[PDB]
Ligand binder design. Structure first.
Ligand code: HEM
Length: 388
């Protein structure tokens, strides 16, 4: 694995969190770039990133976990089958049915917020995805705090005393959930575990172990990323364009468009890796089998060939939803509708309750950021809210 910081070599976390000047420089001066220190080819332009992510015949997701559940690191023809197995639990019917459940959870969390000082990461951005996933999975509401404790340890964290805590949590999680999975095979309900147990593609079906382990992968894909989107949205409403909050407060139908502009502009720096599978000179440079390619979706999202005035936050830009933050092609995020729905529901609920927010002047961004797979992520974000 190549960390972003090995390529950017930025001095501060802040420059990764707000990397606009670097993206511009790469897009304009070196859009298909060889980085000798990591032996990577780096792709920045929108059209090139989109093509690389479509062209699984030349750019593989297999680098260098039971196989049936390894969806991200697989290529066609197995990838399609493995994705379809999981997709049975994320149908549009299910997503529509989830909306009132997610609403109720967001209402409970916002319910507990008071003109007092709120840590939006601790009070909303972290817990909402976790509590939602517990509910959607079919974990009994009585065990929510216990489940959340394991998820916090495993997926927001954060010592080779840490390794030990995670080993213990993973075992506790597995021995909690496995008997639930067993019970649900015999008595299905309307929940993710039950839908996974019934899923069948070309005669392939999940074992109970595979169901449990798929739930752990779902958490690993969805918790920290969704929390990053929620926290960054509030960051942007506090520090990027202060008028946007008022616009959304007076017109809640703008919230989905605002979420797409946060995915475009405030999800930094997200990249994906591929490995060349078939020799090719289609990016205009010849790459041979085994070469490493890094596609920078954060930069593609700032490409003026696709997005007008790309270094400005603009929720009215007509084509923000063409961003590449969820990928493109065969591996495009299976969670994207859920992620979009959680963010719309959370923001809307907060906007209903609070007329104004304001930044806390003592907050230092550099001291409240940590690494993640999808870019620098906020460990807290304080704000003052006016119930007004
Ligand atoms: C803002 C939130 C999210 C972001 C930005 C995000 C981003 C991504 C990206 C970029 C990929 C493509 C990886 C690749 O091509 O190598 C991906 C794949 C995936 N995402 Fe997400 N994701 C998010 C939330 C979620 C959630 C909530 C779930 C599940 C509940 C989830 C499940 C998946 C799965 C299963 C894949 C693999 C799909 C495949 O390989 O066919 N994601 N996501």
């Amino acid at each position: 694995v190549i960390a972003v910081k090995e390529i950017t070599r930025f001095k501060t976390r802040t420059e990764e969190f707000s990397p606009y000047a670097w993206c511009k420089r790469m897009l304009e001066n070196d859009p298909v770039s060889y980085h000798e220190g990591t032996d990577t080819w780096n792709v920045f332009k929108y059209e090139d990133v989109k093509r690389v992510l479509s062209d699984y015949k030349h750019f593989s997701s297999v680098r260098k976990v039971p196989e049936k559940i390894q969806i991200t690191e697989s290529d066609p023809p197995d990838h399609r089958k493995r994705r379809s197995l999981l997709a049975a639990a994320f149908t549009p019917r299910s997503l529509q049915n989830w909306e009132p459940r997610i609403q109720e959870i967001a209402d409970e969390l916002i319910g507990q917020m008071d003109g007092t000082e709120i840590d939006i990461v601790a009070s909303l951005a972290s817990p909402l995805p976790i509590i939602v996933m517990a509910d959607l999975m079919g974990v009994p509401s009585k065990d929510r705090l216990l489940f959340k404790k394991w998820v916090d340890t495993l997926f927001l964290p954060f010592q080779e005393e840490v390794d030990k805590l995670k080993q213990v949590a993973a075992k506790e999680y597995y021995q909690y959930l496995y008997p639930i999975v067993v019970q649900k095979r015999l008595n299905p309900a309307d929940d993710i575990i039950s839908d996974l147990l019934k899923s069948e593609v070309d005669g392939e079906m999940f074992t109970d172990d595979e169901v449990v382990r798929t739930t752990m992968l779902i958490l690993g894909a969805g918790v920290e990323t969704t929390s990053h989107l929620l926290a960054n949205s509030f960051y942007s409403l506090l520090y990027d364009d202060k008028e946007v909050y008022q616009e959304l407060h007076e017109n809640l139908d703008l919230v989905p468009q605002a979420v797409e502009e946060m995915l475009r502009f405030r999800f930094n720096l997200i990249k994906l890796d591929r490995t060349v599978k078939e020799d090719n000179d289609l990016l205009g440079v010849e790459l041979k089998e085994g070469d490493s390619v890094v596609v920078w979706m954060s930069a593609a999202n700032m490409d003026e060939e696709m997005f007008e005035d790309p270094f400005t936050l603009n929720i009215h830009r007509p084509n923000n939803k063409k961003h590449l933050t969820f990928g493109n092609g065969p591996h495009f995020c299976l969670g994207a509708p859920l992620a979009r729905l959680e963010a719309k529901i959370a923001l809307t609920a907060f906007l209903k309750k609070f007329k104004h927010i304001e930044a806390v002047p003592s907050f230092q961004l550099e001291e409240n950021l940590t690494d993640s797979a999808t870019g620098q992520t906020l460990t807290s974000l304080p704000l003052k809210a006016s119930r007004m």
